[PDB]
Design a protein around this ligand. Structure first.
Ligand SMILES: [Mg+2]
Ligand SMILES: [Mg+2]
Ligand SMILES: [Mg+2]
Ligand SMILES: [Mg+2]
Ligand SMILES: [Mg+2]
Ligand SMILES: [Mg+2]
Ligand SMILES: [Mg+2]
Ligand SMILES: [Mg+2]
Ligand SMILES: [Mg+2]
Ligand SMILES: [Mg+2]
Ligand SMILES: [Mg+2]
Length: 127
RNA sequence: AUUUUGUUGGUUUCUAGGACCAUCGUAAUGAUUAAUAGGGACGGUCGGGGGUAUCAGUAUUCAGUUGUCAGAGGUGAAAUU
């Protein structure tokens, strides 16, 4: 039927990565980040920049033959936050509205079974 | 050692006295509770109680392979990087 890639979306609170690979993930097809669409650091992770980033990703996918993708959304994970950034929601909707077909969706945020010390110190970051 | 042998040393038998040792007979012969104190034993347990080994788990970082290409990182915004 369709030809599937894998859209590995890494949405932090400082940027948004839209990365489409093959099934194995060893072959990169298109990688457009929210920082390639704006010249201000403060909105590299904006929903607007993620939508533009996803459209460029979707456009590149079409000329190579990728007609559908599976979604593997992730946050920063590790010792840091597990909730996805604001750009992860926009890049997914933009991909679906660009004529690309959507397959399976999964959260693949790396989650420790209790692990390393987190930055900030005992008293946290004081603001 | 309490008396007397006319008498003082006496003298050791004698007398009597505790103090024990044996036998027999008397006797209802002789051991307070087990504290909703405690200690101990025992029986099924119950615990992320402790120690010594042992087996996971993903994560972090670093490295090896790869894949693409312009930014990545970080913040309230940036910059050092
Ligand atoms: Mg940023
Ligand atoms: Mg730029
Ligand atoms: Mg410090
Ligand atoms: Mg405060
Ligand atoms: Mg006389
Ligand atoms: Mg008792
Ligand atoms: Mg026992
Ligand atoms: Mg896992
Ligand atoms: Mg530059
Ligand atoms: Mg520059
Ligand atoms: Mg950045």
């Amino acid at each position: 039927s369709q030809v599937f890639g894998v859209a590995r979306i890494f949405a932090s609170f400082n940027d948004t990565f839209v990365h489409v690979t093959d099934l194995s993930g060893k072959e990169t097809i298109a990688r457009v980040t929210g920082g390639m669409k704006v010249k201000a650091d403060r909105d590299e992770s904006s929903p607007y920049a993620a939508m533009l980033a996803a459209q460029d990703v979707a456009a590149k996918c079409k000329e190579v033959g990728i007609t559908a993708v599976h979604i593997k959304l992730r946050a920063t994970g590790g010792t840091k936050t597990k909730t996805p950034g604001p750009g992860g929601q926009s890049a997914l909707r933009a991909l679906a509205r660009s004529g690309l077909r959507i397959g399976r969706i999964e959260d693949v945020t790396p989650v420790p079974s209790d692990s390393t010390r987190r930055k900030g110190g005992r008293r946290g970051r004081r603001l």
